[PDB]
């Protein structure tokens, strides 16, 4: 129940990786969702591949 501006997060030069499956990282503003969930946790760098 909100407006999700995903251009700010993508353009910010702070993320080590931004890899999207199912959706394209650029064509994200013209789509909308019933809900979006953010699963947040800390891992070891070498575990990103898993």
């Amino acid at each position: 129940n909100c407006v999700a501006d995903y251009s700010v997060l993508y353009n910010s030069a702070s993320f080590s990786t931004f890899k999207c499956y199912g959706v394209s990282p650029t064509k994200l503003n013209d789509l909308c969702f019933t809900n979006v969930y953010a699963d947040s946790f800390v891992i070891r760098g070498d575990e990103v591949r898993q």
Binding site: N11, A13, P25, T26
Partner: protein
């Protein structure tokens, strides 16, 4: 630097065709382009409308 790839260079400074039929060749330059205290002669573009 690859066809079908995105990022701040792929979109702003070097975009490849998605049907590219070539080769990507690379080697490190730590003993040639780098300079002590930072070699500030290589420019990039992080913003574009």
């Amino acid at each position: 630097i690859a066809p079908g790839q995105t990022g701040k260079i792929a979109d702003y400074n070097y975009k490849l065709p998605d049907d590219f039929t070539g080769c990507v060749i690379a080697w490190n330059s730590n003993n040639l382009d780098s300079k002590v205290g930072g070699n500030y002669n290589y420019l990039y573009r992080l913003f574009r409308k």
